Amino acid sequence: NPAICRYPLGMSGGQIPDEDITASSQWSESTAAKYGRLDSEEGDGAWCPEIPVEPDDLKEFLQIDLHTLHFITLVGTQGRHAGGHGIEFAPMYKINYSRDGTRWISWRNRHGKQVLDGNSNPYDIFLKDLEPPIVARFVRFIPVTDHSMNVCMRVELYGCV
CATH of the domain at 86: 2.60.120.260
The three-state secondary structure class of 144 is strand
- In angstroms, the Cα distances linking 95 to 36, 65, 101, 120 are 18, 13, 14, 17
Contact 74, 95 (CB under 8 A): no
User: What's the number of domains the chain is made of?
Assistant: 1
State the Cα–Cα distance between residues 11 and 20, nearest whole angstrom.
9
- In angstroms, the Cα distances linking 111 to 47, 71, 108, 115, 131 are 29, 20, 8, 10, 9
State the Cα–Cα distance between residues 116 and 133, nearest whole angstrom.
13
Q: Which residues, 6+ apart, have CB-to-CB distance to 47 below 8 Å?
A: 23, 25, 26, 31, 32, 33, 36, 62, 152, 153, 154, 155
Domain that holds residue 35: 1-161
State the Cα–Cα distance between residues 38 and 156, nearest whole angstrom.
6
